Design a binder for this molecule. Sequence first.
Ligand code: LMT
Ligand code: LMT
Lengths: 150, 17, 569
Amino acid sequence: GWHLRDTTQVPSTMKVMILDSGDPNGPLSRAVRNQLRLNGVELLDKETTRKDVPSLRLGKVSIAKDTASVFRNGQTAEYQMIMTVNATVLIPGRDIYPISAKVFRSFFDNPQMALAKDNEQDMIVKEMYDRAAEQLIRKLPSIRAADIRS
Amino acid sequence: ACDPWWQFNWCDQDHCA
Amino acid sequence: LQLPVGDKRRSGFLIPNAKYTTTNYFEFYLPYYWNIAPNMDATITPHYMHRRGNIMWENEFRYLSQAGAGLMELDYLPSDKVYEDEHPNDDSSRRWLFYWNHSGVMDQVWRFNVDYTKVSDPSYFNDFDNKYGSSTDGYATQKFSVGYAVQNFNATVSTKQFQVFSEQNTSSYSAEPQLDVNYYQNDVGPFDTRIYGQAVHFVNTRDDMPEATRVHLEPTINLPLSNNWGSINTEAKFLATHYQQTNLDWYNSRNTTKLDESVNRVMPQFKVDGKMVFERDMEMLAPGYTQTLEPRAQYLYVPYRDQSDIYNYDSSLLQSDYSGLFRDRTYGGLDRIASANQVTTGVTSRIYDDAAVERFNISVGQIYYFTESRTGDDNITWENDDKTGSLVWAGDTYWRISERWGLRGGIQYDTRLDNVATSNSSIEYRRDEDRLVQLNYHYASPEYIQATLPKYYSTAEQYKNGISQVGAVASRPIADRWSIVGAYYYDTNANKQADSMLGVQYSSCCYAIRVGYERKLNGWDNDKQHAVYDNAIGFNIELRGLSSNYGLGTQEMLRSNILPYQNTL
Ligand SMILES: CCCCCCCCCCCCO[C@@H]1O[C@H](CO)[C@@H](O[C@H]2O[C@H](CO)[C@@H](O)[C@H](O)[C@H]2O)[C@H](O)[C@H]1O
Ligand SMILES: CCCCCCCCCCCCO[C@@H]1O[C@H](CO)[C@@H](O[C@H]2O[C@H](CO)[C@@H](O)[C@H](O)[C@H]2O)[C@H](O)[C@H]1O
């Protein structure tokens, strides 16, 4: 009984939103803004006079690189990168709902090409934010459900 | 005069003909 | 001045802590905390080591300012009997470490980052405690970066250097400096446009290696279209690069292919990405559950440019997971840009419950190559000569079985390796931060190691067998005051232990006592061709009651080994 998705990824109650964060020019904010723009969401400033508009506040972002596996001499073989993003969605008058995103990536280490590896690491981070943003969007409908059963 | 400016084409470096 | 609290209390002597290791015998630390001012504190720790028969002075300095938060570390050991015995021909046996970590965003526009580590000798981290480094590190990183970022523009100037520890090829390239610029514009008719520029100077530690100056420009224009059920994005890009290469005499006298002092490389890129979403109600499993099926396709075309006259400074092969299948680059950096004529096809199935919460997802994808991907300098050692067809396959899965149970898995297969390239799996039960059990497995084939790593990796006994590592982590509290933590990481190829850790903490209202034991891989013996193990048993006491930290210390103990625990839900 498959059928094309007849509903928007972002709930219709969230087609107009306010994007708030302590790092408006950061990479996570840019990724979230791009993801929201791709979904047709209209973004307002924090100082807008319009009420009854839900707000999305981006919290702290944690990026951790650890050793996932080691060689026979104890040197790092694979590096595990974990990105944790916390955010809150304030529905005006109703409540606030916390959401989170966790992204895992792995890459092999090569000291002989350390500089190259560093660039690769940067690329991975640039991708991880994007993934995190997607995850946040995928949690928007659930909040809407939490708004109904309350 | 194609030495630098052929690079903007969509063909491979060992193509043409 | 007698036993203050090390967080923000008045300056004084903290509780001394002791340990016994196989590398230093008996060690004991006598720290003194100094609260210089608000947002400024320091810690001076005499660290007596008996096997080395001396005192290492550790100086920690934490600060917070409008430019951001920073931490400096300076460890100095004036003399070392063990190092002097191992290196009798040197003038001095002093060891030292300098570390600096700064991160800050000032005025929402300026970004300052410093990540600097410098050690006196490459064996520093195999002999001393791993707090800002690790014995598993292969090199020390030295990065500075200052950036200016506004909503539609950013420009970063950074310096990256590396101190390589392995005594096989200490030569490494550094970017002194690197300048990156991005500019965006989103309303050029229906199109979104952007430009990326870079200017880098590559310099090597060795004086006989080529030096380079590279300037790169990248204009990109894309057309996105979206529906309620599908989307398609068409992107057209130019890659322009200019190389000025010097110091080529030594390289050109040793290799049959010649590096050019001036190089121009321009190539177009065309990409088409498409996504569809289908939905169904899966009543057989449970009422109200929704299953989504998302096909994704991507055609990529980049012409071929012969790049054998450009030295490879900062381009490395990238792993191809499911997310990396749709990547438009084969290598990092810009020295090597592979020609592409390919289509990537993948599918993702998700299962959400009645509360619109995602409980399951599985992704599988592949890349089909119409023509061979080549850079003009192709030296990767594959297991066969396959060049076209379905060469790369990837799969991923995540299942939130219940509130406390979670399962994750990933696999990467390459037909050119005639074997699974990489794989990882994890199953975790976690009631809270104290009750948890986790089983994980990591695999990397020897073929993948031979393909993506230097030749002596495929030749050396300690690298060539790949990775087959199974790990078990557990933690349990007792009587609301005791915490027990254990970890065991075991290698199945050699049937030998890799890492092992135990930890017992007793927490009280005003104090906490922690005892930790660890046995870890710590080096390789080139004479007898076997691994070296290091054992460490230490005790520590901290003072409670001045803060709200009533935790049992489980999470802190979980992060005290060379293979630290990560929460996988
Ligand atoms: C698509 C769904 C999402 C991904 C789901 C799968 C994820 C979990 C699978 C990873 C765990 C098992 O990982 C699997 O380990 C086995 C056993 O070591 C490896 O298998 C290996 O066996 C022995 C090891 O000496 C070799 O002789 C053999 O050639 C090699 O294949 C596989 O290459 C790896 O895939
Ligand atoms: C789930 C958490 C589990 C926590 C439990 C792990 C903590 C216990 C650490 C292991 C005990 C210490 O024991 C230490 O390892 C083993 C004994 O097993 C001995 O050494 C052994 O290692 C290898 C592989 O492990 C054995 O195959 C071999 O027979 C022997 O060499 C060491 O000489 C001893 O010092």
